[model samples]
Target: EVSAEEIKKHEEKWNKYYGVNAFNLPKELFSKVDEKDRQKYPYNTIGNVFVKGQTSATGVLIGKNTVLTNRHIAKFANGDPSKVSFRPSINTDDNGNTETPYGEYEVKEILQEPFGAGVDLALIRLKPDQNGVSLGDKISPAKIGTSNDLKDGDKLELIGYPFDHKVNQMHRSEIELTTLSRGLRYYGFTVPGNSGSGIFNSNGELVGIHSSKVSHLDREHQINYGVGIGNYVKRIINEKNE
Candidate 1:
């Protein structure tokens, strides 16, 4: 078990990295959508699905109606793909409209890979066309980088929305970024609601998913973990784009 002194030191480092205020996302990291496009892309390219009034997990837009996230996130709340809703630019307050900023959409289909053999990936098809978001005319698919390339001392960024008690009595919907110290496998500390958030390189390329973290009992500092974008995803994208 980690000692109290070690935990304190790590917490200090975390505070410095996160600052007294939550880390601010670089403006360029997210593209702004007009009201029309907001209706198209919604959720700032990410959003949560709810099933039976419980938060399922987060999802990222990959195609016109295709969203990529973890199957576990969708299944966690006993969610049925048919009943899920994606709220774009979702704000913290349910009725107050504090303008936390997000779009809303609904799920039409869920494609889950076979168990055991496949990575924990799930593809969701959203209702209503999303052509307005523009996956880019050239469709230069989101670049994938590897965790193996990350050096131990490299700086990493964690992006996601965390839970808030006041809003929807759930996590406020907003894309937030946090800087983290790199470890051998991964970096950043994340909360429960942060599942499926992407980890990006300094160049803004996605490197991994915020899958989980080392248990509090096992480490001096809380550490976030993710599955590196290795050959598996690369091959799949190449085939799809081809």
Candidate 2:
């Protein structure tokens, strides 16, 4: 239920392009993790999702061929290429460098909730890697959990590829948990291309999906929100079991 106008208001103030590239934060604000860390937890399974030939949102590997992202991102990447290609670690560094030692994988099959059916989450399937190996054979799927168990003031982190940065580097931001309602709302830095990004807790578990930014019109109030992933995780798992 994201509107162009709502995004525009935030865009006009922050990312004028209203895309992920326009980042207000500088490189100094982001410290780098060792390259060795890139192939491990939290970072290993996470990467950039390209939709419609442009950087659209951040997604994570959730299964052998499955990628977890926002329903909005799925729909945006639905047409044109008629698929989504996940290039692990694109725009993942200050110089827009990627850490993927593997090759590219495109997602052609997708599954999503009906309009307002549930959390704005969706799962997509990817083809084998360039080496003809299954995606799951190379990358680890992100572990899924819940937003229900989160406490107020809990800290979370975001790793996403936003096109507004004017570079290919991935942007990082630390956030504080404020509320857990229909969607998880937290106070942090976020912009347009920030949508559909994975929100991880300190434990490196998937708790939320970064989706939208809500700002008050009267005052300068900004809240970044991510849809909870637990329910969807359960739903998909149950379906898989069935």
Candidate 3:
């Protein structure tokens, strides 16, 4: 699944269909991030979250062993921590080679808003490794940032493992942000596995989490929605006491 050529051809098709000038795409719509880059902070903090008997979803490391992902992803685990696991900075190449740099961590706890709260966020607290170390000890956790100050036309970034591109490889997308009265909207390309992907600003701070999208046939680009970090700042800060 590590096909640079394959990604190039596919990205070109997306770019052409969304035409740079017409759809507001920067021609940087889609590209696979290098394996080495994934090992760095913020990027390294991003990884695949596995729920038993379900497809994987993207997640970000927010605390020592705490991972933040969509509530729906964690909902499938049904509060069964043993059924969920996280692997950070996983790299898969075209030759089928795979690397889990930080190894796999199991979930020890799951936290989320009460059902019907209308927020799609969940926090997964992981168990310690054999040596008693945590994921943050191996790689720095992404800084939780506020989306409150986001302005129209800001260039935001997305890093996630999209199933449409490759199985476990990471891909990046540069998108334009538009602030709404109640939420955040972005113009970009997103796919199945991208759900729960962390949305970062230019400074590499996580500002939101991708949750859903809508397609506009006339525009050829997607209007994606994500929960702003600001919406849950109190909940995140309060997690330390929980």
Candidate 4:
């Protein structure tokens, strides 16, 4: 389970960099994806990843029974695959009814880039749910895109479940992305729980995975960081499919 100290340590770093505009306002001020629409298409492929019953991160369905998320949070399971689970399109309604339209699946395996690779990505293979069905069969897997074509100033979209907002709910942000030489850097709004969110382009193609928040050299705008979907991601996906 994610502890209070762990949450504070993670939030303090990113929240301090974010301006007063983010958390200072009511959560409704932000734009959340339409509830019904998010359960459709590419949106339905993304959902909350739970570690020991806590909604800890977001992950995307990439293959039948295969999910993509951050390796860091995946490690939270502490080598026990049973400690991890994924629920696509997880959310709660206004009447306090929690929904898991796609159902929850147990993690059967976890694949991470080797320590030397430092990709910060994980591919989780899920066991079939009680009905013996995979998430990809219910919700189509995300359309994967290569980062090789990314330019300096491309507008991209981010969706994830963030902390201090509605639980198990998804939030969306349309922001500008700066393709860095190593990975990606964007001046956008994101928080701790948003890690592992997929970075998508207008065509709804997955380009990157939200990883961290960095401080600007000017320390003015909050710079969120992500790892572009490179060959390492492709390698992991291939392993899952194979």
Q: Give the local distance difference test score of model 1.
A: 0.50
Q: For residues 1-242, could you state the per-residue lDDT of candidate 3 as single tens digits?
A: 33566446534555652555422544477777786787776688889988878878899888888888888888888788999989887877889998897899988898864323487888888987999998888888888889889987788888887866578888787766754664777767777788889889878899888887744223333457788887555365455522
My TM-score estimates for the predictions, one after another, are 0.62, 0.76, 0.82, 0.83
Worst 10 residues of 1 by lDDT: 169-178
Q: Which of the predicted structures, 2 or 4, would earn the higher TM-score when compared with the native?
A: 4
Ranking by TM-score: 4, 3, 2, 1
Model 4, span 127-177: residue lDDT tens? 988888777777778889887788877878787877555667787766566
Every candidate's lDDT = 0.50, 0.65, 0.76, 0.74
TM-score of 1: 0.62
Superposed model 2: Cα runs more than 4 Å off: 1-34, 79-81, 91-100, 114-118, 216-220, 237-242
Candidate 1 total steric clashes: 14
- Candidate 1 lDDT for residue 241: 27
Estimate, for each residue in 13-92, the C-alpha lDDT of model 1 and write its tens digit: 55543443333533332222234433332225555545546664555555556656666666643436656765534545
Instruction: State the lDDT of candidate 2 residue by residue for 2-69, as single tens digits.
Output: 56686565445444222234233444333233566666777767667777555567787777777777
* Residue-level error in angstroms, candidate 1, position 238: 4.5
